[PDB]
Amino acid sequence: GHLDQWRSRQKIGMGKGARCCVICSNQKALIRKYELNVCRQCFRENAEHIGFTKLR
Amino acid sequence: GKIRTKTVKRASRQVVEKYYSKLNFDFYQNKRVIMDVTIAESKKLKNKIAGYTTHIMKRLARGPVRGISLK
Amino acid sequence: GPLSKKRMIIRDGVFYAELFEFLKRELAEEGFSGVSYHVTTLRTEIVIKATKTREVLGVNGRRIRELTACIQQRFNYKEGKLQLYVERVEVRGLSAMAQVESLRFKLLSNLQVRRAAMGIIRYVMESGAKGCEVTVGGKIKGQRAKSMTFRDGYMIKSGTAHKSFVDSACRHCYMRAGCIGVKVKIMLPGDSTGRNGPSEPLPDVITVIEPK
Amino acid sequence: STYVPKPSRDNVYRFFFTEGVIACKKDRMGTWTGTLGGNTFTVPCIQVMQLMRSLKSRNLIKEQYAWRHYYWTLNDEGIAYMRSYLHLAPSAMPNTQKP
Amino acid sequence: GKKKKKRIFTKPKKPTHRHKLEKMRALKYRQDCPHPQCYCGKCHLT
Amino acid sequence: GQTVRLTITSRNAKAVESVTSQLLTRARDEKVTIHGPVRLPTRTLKITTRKTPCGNGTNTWDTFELKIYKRIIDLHAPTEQVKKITSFTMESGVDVSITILD
RNA sequence: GGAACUUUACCAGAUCCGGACAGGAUGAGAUUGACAGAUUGAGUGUUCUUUCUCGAUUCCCUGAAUGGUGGUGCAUGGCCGCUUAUGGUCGGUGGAGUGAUUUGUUUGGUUGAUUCCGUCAACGGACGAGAUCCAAGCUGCCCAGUAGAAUUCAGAAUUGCCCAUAGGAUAGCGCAUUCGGUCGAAUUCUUCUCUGCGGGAUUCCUUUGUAAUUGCACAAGGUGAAAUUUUGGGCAACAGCAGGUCUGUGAUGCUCCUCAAUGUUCUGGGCGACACGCGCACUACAAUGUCAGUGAGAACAAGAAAACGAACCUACUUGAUCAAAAGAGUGGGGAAACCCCGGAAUCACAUAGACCCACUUGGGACCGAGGAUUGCAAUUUGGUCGCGCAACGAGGAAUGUCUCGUAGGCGCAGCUCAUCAAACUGUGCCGAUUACGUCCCU
Ligand SMILES: [Mg+2]
Ligand SMILES: [Mg+2]
Ligand SMILES: [Mg+2]
Numbered sequence A: 001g002h003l004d005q006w007r008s009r010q011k012i013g014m015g016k017g018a019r020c021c022v023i024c025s026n027q028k029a030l031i032r033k034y035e036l037n038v039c040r041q042c043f044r045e046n047a048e049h050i051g052f053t054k055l056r
Numbered sequence B: 001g002k003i004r005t006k007t008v009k010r011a012s013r014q015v016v017e018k019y020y021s022k023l024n025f026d027f028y029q030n031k032r033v034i035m036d037v038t039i040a041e042s043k044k045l046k047n048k049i050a051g052y053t054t055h056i057m058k059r060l061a062r063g064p065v066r067g068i069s070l071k
Numbered sequence C: 001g002p003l004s005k006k007r008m009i010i011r012d013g014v015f016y017a018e019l020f021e022f023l024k025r026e027l028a029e030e031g032f033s034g035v036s037y038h039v040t041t042l043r044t045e046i047v048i049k050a051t052k053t054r055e056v057l058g059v060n061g062r063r064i065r066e067l068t069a070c071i072q073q074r075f076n077y078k079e080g081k082l083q084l085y086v087e088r089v090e091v092r093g094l095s096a097m098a099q100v101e102s103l104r105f106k107l108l109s110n111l112q113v114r115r116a117a118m119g120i121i122r123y124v125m126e127s128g129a130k131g132c133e134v135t136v137g138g139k140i141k142g143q144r145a146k147s148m149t150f151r152d153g154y155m156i157k158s159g160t161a162h163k164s165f166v167d168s169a170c171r172h173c174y175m176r177a178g179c180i181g182v183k184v185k186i187m188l189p190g191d192s193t194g195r196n197g198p199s200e201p202l203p204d205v206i207t208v209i210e211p212k
Numbered sequence D: 001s002t003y004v005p006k007p008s009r010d011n012v013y014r015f016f017f018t019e020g021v022i023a024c025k026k027d028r029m030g031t032w033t034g035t036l037g038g039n040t041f042t043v044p045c046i047q048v049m050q051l052m053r054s055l056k057s058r059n060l061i062k063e064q065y066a067w068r069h070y071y072w073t074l075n076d077e078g079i080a081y082m083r084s085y086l087h088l089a090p091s092a093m094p095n096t097q098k099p
Numbered sequence E: 001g002k003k004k005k006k007r008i009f010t011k012p013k014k015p016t017h018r019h020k021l022e023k024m025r026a027l028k029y030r031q032d033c034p035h036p037q038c039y040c041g042k043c044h045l046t
Numbered sequence F: 001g002q003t004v005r006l007t008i009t010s011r012n013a014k015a016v017e018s019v020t021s022q023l024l025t026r027a028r029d030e031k032v033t034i035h036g037p038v039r040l041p042t043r044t045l046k047i048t049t050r051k052t053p054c055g056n057g058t059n060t061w062d063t064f065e066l067k068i069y070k071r072i073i074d075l076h077a078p079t080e081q082v083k084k085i086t087s088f089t090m091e092s093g094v095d096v097s098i099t100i101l102d
Numbered sequence G: 001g002g003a004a005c006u007u008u009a010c011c012a013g014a015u016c017c018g019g020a021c022a023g024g025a026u027g028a029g030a031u032u033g034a035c036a037g038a039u040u041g042a043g044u045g046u047u048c049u050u051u052c053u054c055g056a057u058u059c060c061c062u063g064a065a066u067g068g069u070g071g072u073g074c075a076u077g078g079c080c081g082c083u084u085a086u087g088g089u090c091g092g093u094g095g096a097g098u099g100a101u102u103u104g105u106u107u108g109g110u111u112g113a114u115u116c117c118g119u120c121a122a123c124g125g126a127c128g129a130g131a132u133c134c135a136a137g138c139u140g141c142c143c144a145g146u147a148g149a150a151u152u153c154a155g156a157a158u159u160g161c162c163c164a165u166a167g168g169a170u171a172g173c174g175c176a177u178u179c180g181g182u183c184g185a186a187u188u189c190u191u192c193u194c195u196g197c198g199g200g201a202u203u204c205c206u207u208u209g210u211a212a213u214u215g216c217a218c219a220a221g222g223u224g225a226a227a228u229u230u231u232g233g234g235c236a237a238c239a240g241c242a243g244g245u246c247u248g249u250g251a252u253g254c255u256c257c258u259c260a261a262u263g264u265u266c267u268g269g270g271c272g273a274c275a276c277g278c279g280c281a282c283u284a285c286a287a288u289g290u291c292a293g294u295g296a297g298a299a300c301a302a303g304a305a306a307a308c309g310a311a312c313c314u315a316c317u318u319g320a321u322c323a324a325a326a327g328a329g330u331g332g333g334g335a336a337a338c339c340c341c342g343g344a345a346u347c348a349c350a351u352a353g354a355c356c357c358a359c360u361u362g363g364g365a366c367c368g369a370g371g372a373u374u375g376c377a378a379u380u381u382g383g384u385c386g387c388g389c390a391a392c393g394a395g396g397a398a399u400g401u402c403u404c405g406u407a408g409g410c411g412c413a414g415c416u417c418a419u420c421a422a423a424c425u426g427u428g429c430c431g432a433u434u435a436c437g438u439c440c441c442u
């Protein structure tokens, strides 16, 4: 009963709720390009380690 | 706005003092000498140094210049 | 299915960021100054650069085996495909990431901010750095927050040459009053070997070879 | 469901002794997977997080967190209790402890 | 903020469920669940 | 007769050039037919994000780029000779893939 | 920050504890979960009736704990914006002050430039400026079976006298042109293309130029692919700001809630409700137009999956014995390989095409009936037929941005993203007027 009711909508894979940042689990401003799945604010700090650099 | 920055001017003056008989009135031969006689991370600065060294040599032919002392 | 070339590098960068963050949080107590990895068919061979390599190793490799287990469980590495190595940094005072940690420990030890920052700068200057900058910001003198910066030597802050000639690191020190930010920037002197320093001449300087 | 069965609990305990450290992603859904002398056994991640929350509150383990993943390690007193809980032979040491 | 302004209830407070204690239920008992792995409480089979 | 392709991919231009030069030198030492080192187009991954963490002020943006350098080397050599050519110290950040072309 | 659910932080409900841990009261019945019937919005054990099942995992109450997109950005970290696009900034030691303070850092020229030159109670420094950096031009080596070319042997097609509707203009005068399916063979090569390092520009050269009357420079012309910070970016000192963010984070101090919860899940609704005011867009007001044909033509890019392929993007066929939108099938692409020979839209057309100055075949607001498709959910989104008689005929006071591949016009890609761009970040296409000044205004 309540086990089935618990998080039944969350079990569905669709939606902004399913996708979250891989560093902070925040579902807002997610960079899905190249399947990065990182929020923009976290990407700003982790860009150098990933390999991105500021040019032009 | 084509003024030679103090770095360029000092480097060119040192070049003229160190090598005077090895320089000329043209720019390209002077730059060719500059590449060997100077070590720098840039080529724009080398070109500017060569140009101002040519200017210094042209001035020196007419008369002595302030800041350069040839022994 | 095989992953695309533009996706494999993204995965590798994400993995490196994961490993760097995990190692930073784990070895914050020790003085650690970097991590590299060289994947091959046989083995991964992750290397860490630190200062307190004795405590990173532990007794009979206790902590290094614990870290290897951590990484293996995290990244599903097959048994025997992963190894961890630790190397002592050649110069302790030339690593901002170690110096900030040391300064954070000094701050958390209830030491005065001016004295701790001055000691950090003195050690960095003794280590041979061309210049050092230390910034401490937060509620130091009471409810109102202030920022104090202590400088010595040369420090370039413009262009892209500073991203190579200067190494920087920032940490958050948590105190009963609140959070205090500590930042340490070091100007690495040029060394022809390339182990420390950029190994190239400064963009500004022009040197004329002495005639024979 | 944080209600964890005893067989899954002691299987997780046996894994945590065998391997000195254990990692689990912070996810209420999904299953944590482990290996005990071969094969593969799964247990939901939430029960593992609850169990090792209990261990951390009892000062049994040391916990670290980074990028939506936990890392739980066993100290000397932690390994001691684990031997006592599993009634394991004395002188038995985790794979990390074994030279 | 989210002030705890409290709430008026139009219904009574539902009680917490308690397991019924059957003392020595084994002595009292009876059909074994036909279901292989297993009304059958384990399989909820009616 | 039988041809094998080495694909060297990296983020570091210096590293990929050094690895390609090392492979070319090893192939020349081994005296095998080499169809040149081909420099495939460099691929740029670009991501633009808001600089601010809150949405306040002038809408300033930040552009991050990542460059991909790929080289291919075609040679006529069997598996053992190719393995002997490829087996050396390598460099970190670059990867070499072996393929057999039909 | 393009919200169907989720997100979501708000509202009406209903679940769970995800209160660890310690101390009590229990207790091998502590407990867990339940079929049915009714409870209910719920074929929700949610709670009950009811018995089963699970088994020391858990209950009970006491402190505690925990979580919070609770608070406070006037407690903070970090980051960002702004001051502040300009040329600024600060030691030391010496000089001057009773001192705060000052000099250096001055004025003259020069410059985008605290840029240089000259001067000098300063003399030496440090930082910004410039330099460095990353793209655009032009070029050297390399390089091709993920890029091209030109030959040669075939295979083929047109082939001469040919005069539109009324049929103008616009090169050709050993060897006639063609034919990415003719899927032709062979041989050679790197004109284009690819790309890691190179080069190239420096006021370099020339004025009976200006200036100089040392200089620092400057204006024309030259040379050149490029002639002045070559061009567009990035980076950017030192002070600030109670600027924004406690809704990015396992950044946090202090507080608040904490088991009919300010935690968490689930259900229904809201975030999109209108008389209005304002910011910013998009489409219009037609003929330098609108329909309907044909033609020729870019660039930036993106593509599939955990604990053998399948998801992703595609071409081609078919549906088709008959609208679109579909829907199938078959291949290919992990992306210089497939898409792709990337048939973009501006644009062209001597198309002998329609309209003919009207709110009209201008303009689509808004609404009706059908059908498709995304989706768990459409009370989303295409497509078809109606509606157009919705304004609007170029916009008062006002007021934005912009100097060359620029403005403007035109598309295209990425992004968010199951579905949905009048948005943004890029990208090519077509391509002007004016100025080359000034301190009137700010
Ligand atoms: Mg406010
Ligand atoms: Mg305020
Ligand atoms: Mg938007």
Ligand SMILES: [Zn+2]
Pocket (backbone or CB within 6 Å): A021, A022, A023, A024, A025, A026, A038, A039, A041, A042, A043, G248, G249
């Ligand atoms: Zn994040």
